[PDB]
Amino acid sequence: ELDQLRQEAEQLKNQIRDARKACADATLSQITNNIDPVGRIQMRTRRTLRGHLAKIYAMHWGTDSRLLVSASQDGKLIIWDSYTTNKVHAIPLRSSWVMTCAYAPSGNYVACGGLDNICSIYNLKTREGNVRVSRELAGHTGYLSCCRFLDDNQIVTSSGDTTCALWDIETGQQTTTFTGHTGDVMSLSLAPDTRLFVSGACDASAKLWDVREGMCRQTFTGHESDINAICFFPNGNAFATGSDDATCRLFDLRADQELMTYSHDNIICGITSVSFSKSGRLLLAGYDDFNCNVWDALKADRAGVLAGHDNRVSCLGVTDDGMAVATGSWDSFLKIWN
Amino acid sequence: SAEERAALERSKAIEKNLKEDGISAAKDVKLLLLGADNSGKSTIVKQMKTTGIVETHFTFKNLHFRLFDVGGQRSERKKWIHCFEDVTAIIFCVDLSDMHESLMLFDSICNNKFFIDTSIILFLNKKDLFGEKIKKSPLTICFPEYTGPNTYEDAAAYIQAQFESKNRSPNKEIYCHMTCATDTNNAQVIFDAVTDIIIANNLRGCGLY
């Protein structure tokens, strides 16, 4: 009967909640009182990339931290040169309803996707001298929300039908599919060791997945609304989330609970993006109020403001060596700060 | 400098091509085709001549139309409806064979923050079977509040008034029309509505608004 299974599930939930509450002896807020603050931080825009003309949606840095990539509703996928503002490629897309971008770690490929339910992979090192479509990965039902390269042969995708998949670019077939979510997955982030990843959905829950076996190991349920952004801590043991509740939270993998909340009374707009710095001391969040905020990871206090855009800050990223931060927006301009 | 002059030349050529494409791509007019299931969304585009989005196009009197049907995929509408702002108008259509879900959808669309100043064209479809049903069955089974006679004209007027009563912002306008499977008339209605809208936009852009 359903009653016995419901009672068993309730007992299991109560047991795990009791264990989680028992595992918490103190809080990090009362441990961090012995370290000094970072002071006031004021960055200035050193570059401005003005080639697009409609609502940049995604961007991604290269491994060498000099090249970029950007997608817009204009239907163009363009890769930039950050140091000299030069344009080195401009790929014309088949459909203009795109929402994702990805740069291969080896620098040979670029991926894209959107409302057409298909992930397209492009080859940048052809002998003929032009970029051409390599594969068209089909099989998902809902729209694509995120994509990430593991190597030059396998990719992971998150869609709007509550499932994630692991593909094989060599043959175009889905090796493994990850199910267990209720709403639709919005974001995705890969571990530095490339052995595990996490995802956040619209049912206010983020969970940890293993790429080898399609099992779900843990579930985090501390938020109040849909999760919009996900990123790993540089160490590989923690991660932070952003939601339409206008708050951010920091979670721990080996303690399986929440550590900090990054919120203030004056901010009532949802988060669109999140990222860490190189050493993990600072946390950058792109807000809906036309500006970005810099917050201490260990004290939950604001350290600076990166205003200077005229519309939503849709995307945000930090280079590998950590010498710059790029900020896309709906005004069709990319800013490089330092 | 060094041979980076060729790189600068390549960048300039890319920029010129981008500007030309952007200039050439702005002459078209975009329209969003929303409605309930089995309402006749396919019929209007078939007369005017699949998993994700489908985009048909046609030209009529030196003007190019591009119609988008984004109702084929089932997901959270709050996560992809903000992509279709800055569209010229909505082409919401309703069938008279039912039904309150259509009223709910109209109420949701007409008051969205992204679509606060977008004109809406309303089509009332399949009037003949509506007349047959009203001759066979009363309208009170669908609208208990209705008190008028069971004839065609007042019933259609009552349905149109009920649909139009959901508008709250007075800035926008709703163009009602009962096509009843009329040939080559819906295109003319859309053309006149588009002409009015573009004239208003041109007048507002100069500062006379």
């Epitope: 032009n130 | 980076e4 060729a6």
Partner: single-chain antibody, 232 residues
């Protein structure tokens, strides 16, 4: 299958004119540069002309300025060369070359076949190669070196030196660009290094297919070296 086919050779009396054409297929011709390197019958290589992409920048050699001109036709995928007032020093073989310039590109990657033009009887950077012939045996390792008059290092950090290999009865090939980067196809047995104005090339585990003449070229501003030959 990238193809560069040339035609227009023959015998021309002194003082006349003759046109040569390059017909290309298999790649996007409109996105590439074009050069016209030529080789004397029993000497090294020499640079002649250059036509950009979009036909917006043309350079000519000092000894052939005014007498010759270059043009391209993107629709038909062809490149021309019009030469007037031929002298006795204009007899050589002419090569059609390919090049693309952006961040990370490798110019001078594909070379043509060649046309023979014979005529009847009637301030600069100098690069020198200290050796002209080096004895070698299979399984051994050798070292090539050439020096320049001035430093090839720019303020941006890139040094512009190129290495080429020509075999018996064959068109030359690209091995190293910018003194450190290996071409797409060359085996790992070849590696190059150098600093300032002294440049070296080393090859390990020599086979029977490595025999030929090696040229070193600079690309800092708008020449080839004399070239050394390995002997079996």
């Amino acid at each position: 299958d990238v193809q560069l086919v040339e035609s227009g050779g023959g015998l021309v009396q002194p003082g006349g004119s003759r046109k040569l054409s390059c017909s290309a297929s298999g790649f996007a011709f409109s996105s590439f540069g074009m050069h016209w390197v030529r080789q004397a019958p029993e000497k090294g290589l020499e640079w002649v002309a250059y036509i950009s992409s979009g036909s917006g920048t043309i350079y000519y050699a000092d000894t052939v300025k005014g007498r010759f001109t270059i043009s391209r036709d993107d629709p038909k995928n062809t490149l021309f060369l019009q030469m007037t007032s031929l002298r006795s020093e204009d007899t050589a073989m002419y090569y059609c070359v390919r090049s693309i310039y952006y961040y990370g590109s490798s110019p001078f990657d594909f070379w043509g076949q060649g046309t023979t033009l014979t005529v009847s009887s009637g301030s600069d950077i100098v690069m020198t190669q200290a050796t002209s012939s080096v004895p070698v045996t299979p399984g051994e390792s050798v070292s090539i070196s050439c020096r320049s008059s001035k430093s090839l290092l720019h303020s941006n950090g890139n040094t512009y030196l190129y290495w080429f290999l020509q075999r018996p009865g064959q068109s030359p090939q690209l091995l190293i660009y910018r003194m450190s980067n290996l071409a797409s196809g060359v085996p790992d047995r070849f590696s190059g290094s150098g600093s300032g104005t002294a440049f070296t090339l080393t090859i390990s585990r020599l086979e029977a297919e490595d025999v030929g003449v090696y040229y070193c070229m600079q690309h800092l501003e708008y020449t080839f070296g004399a070239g050394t030959k390995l002997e079996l």
